[PDB]
């Protein structure tokens, strides 16, 4: 009886997923699933399949935030400590990477040859995104609004696209959604950026949790050479300086613009009341 | 100006990977197994590259995870490029490897890559688990972890080559034996070199001689005192023997025996 194996197997799986679970236990998953279902209104995909897609998509999302936190050197997330301050860097890297490959295992269960091709590209896309973020930081600068957007579409907005890409593989709906997907990607991220600041006498780096954020970008470019982001970064009571230059204003407008661009591109794809409810629910904070 | 900056970032992401490859000091090996597996060169080359890619990506992450200061005498990658870059290079490379495994155009090859990478992540799992709890594996737990890390990559490379062979005889037994053989051999080498604490010379890494010491100031002298070098020399002899045995079983392999002989010289 070598049950000492089974024990160490059961043990290691638990540990491997603890950082991942510390992040799932924050508020979140609720909305990213009202989304899938909504899109399925066009793509009419079987239920077993949609669940697997949603799980995979949620797996990558969370594992990526674990890493973003380490890379941006964040102290908090949604008010709590970041996972690596509690579990340590090693264990968190190990956990996030382990989840990516479990995401892979899981994609395989879809049992459709293009699924891995699609997964693989997204994962490469995502890391390139992280790369950009570290690049701007190594050069003591800050992206433009246009460059920020592009980074979002690659990172943790890009991921919808995988979700809907994989769904499409199981649908006869073959009209092109990439456009509407970009639009929602930017809309979710920027909403979030907005929400998180519009939320001490705190400085800007501290509120953004060391992350590039739409309102703080715009503010930095708005009063060849690099950007000297230290003034809008260590500017006391940010949630004012940001009222002052009017970035909260600009952002609200930017979101209103995208809200509307969505409703346009949605009608172009036939209409989808399920999703329009979801947009208008989501708009109500501006 | 977004597409230029995009390409530049893909050249950048590979820099920590290449730092590690350029370090001074597995390819007699691949051909040696190819003796049984009669693999198409083109497919072989792809397997070799995937294996190398995955192997060094994983060394990058191990060095972060073990907080190692050196590797073969050189500063570890993250001490030069920083943790964010290294995490970010190694993971990019792992998925470049998956991309490359897809060019094999065999559906079980993704199946296998996944299993092996899962197995590997569980191995580092235990490694970090033990370090985080102020503890040390016993001999059997160490042997087992090693088999999960290197049996992970070894097994991957031999598993892939076997998908492209009509040689279907079971090779895991020999691979476990070699997997232990190389690790423990390396542990023995690293330390036997000696003219000074132990987590320092092992470089954050759990090591066979030390582990055996631990379950009975200066480290190289302490291991002499308890006869760990002694014990490990025996343990390696037992392993070499066992390998010669498991090779005869599989039809023999002059090239592989020649290699095991070259490696054993130092014990
Ligand atoms: O069934 P086979 O012995 O031809 C196969 N070997 C191969 N399968 C495949 C393969 C490719 C796509 C789908 C299924 C098998 N390709 C190749 S190329 C050289 C060998 C080989 P397996 O992996 O089951 O031993």
For residue B70, give the H/E element and its range.
strand B70-71
How many whole angstroms separate alpha carbon B167 and alpha carbon B165? Answer: 5
Sign of CA dihedral B128, B130, B135, B139: negative
Residues 6+ apart with CB under 8 A from A24: A62
Residues 212-271 of A with CB under 8 A from B: none
How many CA atoms within 13 Å lie on the side-chain side of A173? 16
Give A77's DSSP letter.
E
Residues A74, A75, A79, A80, Cα dihedral to 10°: 110
Residues 6+ apart with CB under 8 A from B251: B36, B169
The answer to whether the annotation marks A216 as part of a ligand binding site is no
How many whole angstroms separate alpha carbon A167 and alpha carbon A1? Answer: 46
Closest by alpha carbon to B58, among B111, B127, B112, B9? B127
How many whole angstroms separate alpha carbon A20 and alpha carbon A91? Answer: 10
Residues 6+ apart with CB under 8 A from A19: A66, A83, A84, A87, A91, A92, A95, A96
Residues 6+ apart with CB under 8 A from A52: A106, A107, A109, A110
Tell me which residue has its CA closest to atom 3 in ligand 1.
B166
Q: What is the CA radius of gyration of chain A?
A: 20
Instruction: Centre a 10 Å sphere on the Cβ of residue B133 and count the other Cβ atoms it contains.
Output: 8
Task: Name A176's bridge partners.
Answer: none
Q: 3-state class of B75 per DSSP? A: strand
CB < 8 Å to B206, chain A: none
Note whether B84 contacts A11, CB cutoff 8 Å.
Answer: no
* Residue A124 · residue A104 · CB < 8 Å: no
B118 vs A91, A94, A101: nearest CB: A101
Task: Name A77's bridge partners.
Answer: A80
| Token pair recorded at residue B50 | 């995937």
Q: Are strands B74-75 and A80-81 parallel, antiparallel or unpaired?
A: unpaired
- Please choose from B39, B44, B163, B168 the residue to mutate so as to test ligand 1's pocket, defined by most ligand atoms within 8 A of CB: B163
Instruction: Centre a 10 Å sphere on the Cβ of residue A176 and count the other Cβ atoms it contains.
Output: 9
* Residue A20 · residue A96 · CB < 8 Å: yes
Q: How many residues does chain B have?
A: 267
CA A92 to chain centre: 18
B128 vs A73, A91, A101: nearest CB: A91
Q: 3-state class of A80 per DSSP? A: strand
* Residue A141 · residue A199 · CB < 8 Å: no
How many whole angstroms separate alpha carbon B134 and alpha carbon B214? Answer: 13
Q: How far is CA B41 from CA A206, B37, B38, B48, B113, in A?
A: 55, 11, 9, 10, 20
Instruction: Centre a 10 Å sphere on the Cβ of residue A262 and count the other Cβ atoms it contains.
Output: 21
| Token pair recorded at residue B20 | 């590690």
Q: What is the CA radius of gyration of chain B?
A: 19
Tell me which residue has its CA closest to atom 18 in ligand 1.
B164
Q: How far is CA B60 from CA A167, A178, B42, B69, B147, in A?
A: 35, 36, 27, 12, 19
Q: How far is CA A195 from CA A132, A143, A151, A188, A210, in A?
A: 24, 20, 19, 10, 16
* Residue A262 · residue A180 · CB < 8 Å: yes
How many whole angstroms separate alpha carbon A57 and alpha carbon B247? Answer: 45
Task: Name B74's bridge partners.
Answer: B71
The third-level CATH classification (topology) of the domain covering B1-267 is Farnesyl Diphosphate Synthase (1.10.600)
CB < 8 Å to B111, chain A: 108
How many whole angstroms separate alpha carbon B219 and alpha carbon B206? Answer: 14
* Residue A104 · residue A119 · CB < 8 Å: yes
Q: Does B13 touch chain A (CB under 8 A)?
A: yes
Cα B168 to ligand 1 centroid, rounded to whole Å: 12
Note whether A134 contacts B61, CB cutoff 8 Å.
Answer: no
**Ligand 1 atom with the shortest distance to the CA of B168:** 25
Instruction: Centre a 10 Å sphere on the Cβ of residue B134 and count the other Cβ atoms it contains.
Output: 6
| Token pair recorded at residue B139 | 């001999």
3 state SS for A140-168: CCCCCHHHHHHHHHHCCCHHHHHHHHHHH
Q: How far is CA B144 from CA B116, B120, B157, B176, B240, in A?
A: 15, 12, 19, 10, 18
Which contacts (CB < 8 Å, 24+ apart) does range B135-142 have? B136/B206, B136/B210, B136/B211, B136/B214, B136/B215, B137/B206, B137/B211, B138/B211, B138/B215, B139/B208, B139/B211, B139/B212, B139/B215, B141/A8, B142/B206, B142/B208, B142/B211
Give B227's DSSP letter.
T
Tell me which residue has its CA closest to atom 13 in ligand 1.
B106
Orientation of helix B41-65 relative to helix B139-163, angle to 10°: 150
Q: Does A86 touch chain B (CB under 8 A)?
A: no
Instruction: Centre a 10 Å sphere on the Cβ of residue A44 and count the other Cβ atoms it contains.
Output: 11
**Cβ burial, residue B18 (10 Å; 0-12/13-18/19+):** exposed
Closest by alpha carbon to B155, among B118, B187, B104, B112? B112
For residue B36, give the H/E element and its range.
helix B27-37
| Token pair recorded at residue B71 | 């590797």
Cα B107 to ligand 1 centroid, rounded to whole Å: 9
The answer to whether the annotation marks B103 as part of a ligand binding site is no
Please state the domain extents for chain B: 1-267
3 state SS for B146-182: HHHHHHHHHHHHHHHHHHCCCCCCCCHHHHHHHHHHH
CA angle A251, A257, A258 (to 5 degrees): 95
Residues 6+ apart with CB under 8 A from B185: B236, B263, B266, B267
Closest by alpha carbon to A11, among B46, B129, B180? B129
For chain B, give the longest Cα–Cα distance. 64
Q: 3-state class of B26 per DSSP? A: coil
Residues 6+ apart with CB under 8 A from A3: none
Residues A17, A21, A23, A26, Cα dihedral to 10°: 180
Q: Does B94 touch chain A (CB under 8 A)?
A: yes
Residues with beta carbon inside 6 Å of ligand 1?
B 105-107, 163-164, 166
Give A199's DSSP letter.
-
Place of tokens 């350029």: B22
Tell me the CATH architecture of domain A1-286.
Orthogonal Bundle (1.10)
Residues B104, B109, B114, B115, Cα dihedral to 10°: -150
Note whether A94 contacts B131, CB cutoff 8 Å.
Answer: no
What ranges make up the beta strands (E) of A53-150?
76-77, 80-81
Q: What is the nearest CA distance from A244 to chain B, expressed in angstroms?
A: 30
Q: 3-state class of B203 per DSSP? A: coil
Q: Does A85 touch chain B (CB under 8 A)?
A: no
Instruction: Centre a 10 Å sphere on the Cβ of residue A153 and count the other Cβ atoms it contains.
Output: 20
* Residue A145 · residue A221 · CB < 8 Å: yes
How many whole angstroms separate alpha carbon A258 and alpha carbon A248? Answer: 15
CB < 8 Å to B91, chain A: 67, 97, 100, 127
In A, minimum Cα distance to B15 occurs at: A131
How many CA atoms within 13 Å lie on the side-chain side of A211? 27
């Amino acid at each position: 009886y070598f049950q000492s194996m089974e024990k160490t197997q059961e043990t290691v799986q638990r540990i491997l997923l603890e950082p991942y679970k510390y992040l799932l236990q924050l508020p979140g998953k609720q909305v990213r699933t009202k989304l899938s279902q909504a899109f399925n209104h066009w793509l009419k995909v079987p239920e077993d399949k949609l669940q697997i897609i949603i799980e995979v998509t949620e797996m990558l999302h969370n594992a990526s935030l674990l890493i973003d936190d380490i890379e941006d050197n964040s102290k908090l997330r949604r008010g709590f400590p970041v996972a690596h301050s509690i579990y340590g860097i090693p264990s968190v890297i190990n956990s996030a990477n382990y989840v990516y490959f479990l995401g892979l295992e899981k994609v395989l269960t879809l049992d459709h040859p293009d699924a891995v091709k699609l997964f693989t590209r997204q994962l490469l896309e995502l890391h390139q995104g992280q790369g950009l973020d570290i690049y701007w930081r190594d050069n003591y600068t800050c992206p433009t609004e246009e460059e920020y957007k592009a980074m979002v579409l690659q990172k943790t907005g890009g991921l919808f696209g995988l979700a809907v890409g994989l769904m499409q593989l199981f649908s006869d709906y073959k009209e092109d959604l990439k456009p509407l997907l970009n639009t929602l990607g930017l809309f979710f991220q920027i909403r979030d950026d907005y929400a998180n600041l519009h939320s001490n006498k705190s400085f800007c780096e501290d509120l953004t949790e060391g992350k590039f954020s739409f309102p703080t970008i715009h503010a930095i470019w708005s009063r060849i050479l690099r950007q000297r982001t230290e003034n809008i970064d260590i500017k006391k009571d940010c949630v004012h300086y940001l009222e002052d230059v009017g970035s909260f204003e600009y952002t609200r407008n930017t979101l209103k613009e995208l809200e509307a661009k969505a409703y346009k591109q949605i009608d172009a794809r036939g209409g989808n009341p399920e999703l329009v409810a979801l947009v208008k629910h989501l708009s109500k904070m501006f």
